[PDB]
Scaffold this active site. Structure first.
Site, short mmCIF file in Angstrom:
data_model
loop_
_atom_site.label_atom_id
_atom_site.label_comp_id
_atom_site.label_asym_id
_atom_site.label_seq_id
_atom_site.Cartn_x
_atom_site.Cartn_y
_atom_site.Cartn_z
N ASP A 118 48.08 54.87 85.13
CA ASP A 118 46.75 55.17 85.61
C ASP A 118 45.74 55.34 84.48
O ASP A 118 46.10 55.82 83.40
CB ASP A 118 46.80 56.43 86.48
CG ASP A 118 47.75 57.46 85.93
OD1 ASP A 118 47.52 57.97 84.81
OD2 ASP A 118 48.72 57.79 86.65
N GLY A 150 42.62 53.33 94.78
CA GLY A 150 43.13 53.59 93.45
C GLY A 150 42.88 52.50 92.42
O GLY A 150 41.75 52.08 92.22
N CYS A 198 48.07 50.44 95.70
CA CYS A 198 48.50 51.47 94.76
C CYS A 198 49.33 52.50 95.53
O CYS A 198 50.32 52.13 96.16
CB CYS A 198 47.27 52.10 94.09
SG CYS A 198 47.62 53.33 92.79
N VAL A 199 48.93 53.77 95.51
CA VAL A 199 49.74 54.77 96.21
C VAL A 199 49.02 55.73 97.17
O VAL A 199 49.59 56.15 98.18
CB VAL A 199 50.54 55.62 95.19
CG1 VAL A 199 49.60 56.43 94.32
CG2 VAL A 199 51.51 56.52 95.93
#
Lengths: 152, 152, 150
Positions: free
Chosen positions: A64, A101, A96-97
């Site tokens: 990140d 993101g 992403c998560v």
């Protein structure tokens, strides 16, 4: 889910699904014609069901705030080149998560390769997703040196 | 109804209306500024009311799956050239008979004429309508040889 | 609110807010990343709260085509803002509906390389009833400086 198209390219920036909502996830991807999913963050779900439906999943995580390594960029551009050529009108999904993101980053890179300056790529994505990129990301996109080798 | 715009061109790919829902149909077309409707499939409704409202209807049907004849393509490109020039900001609507059908084909042809390769045109349309074209159509768009005579 | 983006430019054509709905207005503008608001019609609300939030408000009121000075000031704003603040947005609004708000946006697009018809279609794709006859007529006679670089 935000969808961005430029030349022969079409991308689907989606959210990270769950093993539970995986069926509906796959159903939607299929309707968007996605043939590949690139996961750039934590791998949270099993991909056997996805792969079985003809959707290949690629795990290319990148720290990140940290810019994607040159190898990831090369692998990404190589994927963009071949997929949109061998499967006309297909779509590549990226996620992403937790929220957009850093999923938008690779898409921006593809657009820059397509001829846009990073600011244009950022605006083009923001027109679809208002909160697209954060400060750290804008700063390194500003320093990104495109290979500009993709032909259209 | 999907709307696609590229240079001085703007198209409305709509559904086939019914003599009953014709009033609302006309009302919407007018708001989109459409001045012409091209029916590429079965003619299912009376056009007197449509023509009276200042919307000219053209019936240019082209076979099951079969690619549009060269004459249809020439007539279509001629319509695109004059309409968007003589009526700046207007819109041309196109529809088939049951859903999108073959209606997006002519629009793709106009985009290609505008400078896009067929893959780009397909993605550009799919970004608006996910299930736009079918296999047979993609195959003949791939073999389509544009005249590339429109100027912008 | 309609949003139009072209090169390094991104515009938000919004509605005229009220001193009462100003907080929500500001909240949305911030999410769209707008750093500037150009009011081309009557000034109906206090801008202290807006300015405090880091959103500069410009009153360039101008039917009658915008004066050459307004066009120059607008093009100057477009040039510097999208350059100094990559990915930002410029909002524009009139008083009761789209109004004349879209005109300046069309001018920026023409400067970006579009002919006026393309700019009009590009905006209409977002807002069907965008421009009126009088406006189309003078956009047709507009002579762009074509000095913006991209």
């Amino acid at each position: 889910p935000v969808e961005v198209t430029y030349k022969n390219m079409r991308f689907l920036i989606t959210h990270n699904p769950t093993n539970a909502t995986l069926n509906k996830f796959i159903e939607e991807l299929k309707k968007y014609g996605v043939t590949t999913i690139v996961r750039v963050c934590e791998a949270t779900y099993d991909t056997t069901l996805v792969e079985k439906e003809g959707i290949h999943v690629l795990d290319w995580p990148f720290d990140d705030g940290a810019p994607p390594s040159n190898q990831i960029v090369d692998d990404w551009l190589s994927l963009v080149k071949i997929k949109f050529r061998e499967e006309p009108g297909c779509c590549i999904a990226v996620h992403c998560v937790a929220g957009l993101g850093r999923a938008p980053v690779l898409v921006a890179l593809a657009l820059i390769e397509g001829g846009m300056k990073y600011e244009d790529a950022v605006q083009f994505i923001r027109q679809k997703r208002r909160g697209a990129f954060n400060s750290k990301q804008l700063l390194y996109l500003e320093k990104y040196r495109p290979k500009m080798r993709l032909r259209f």
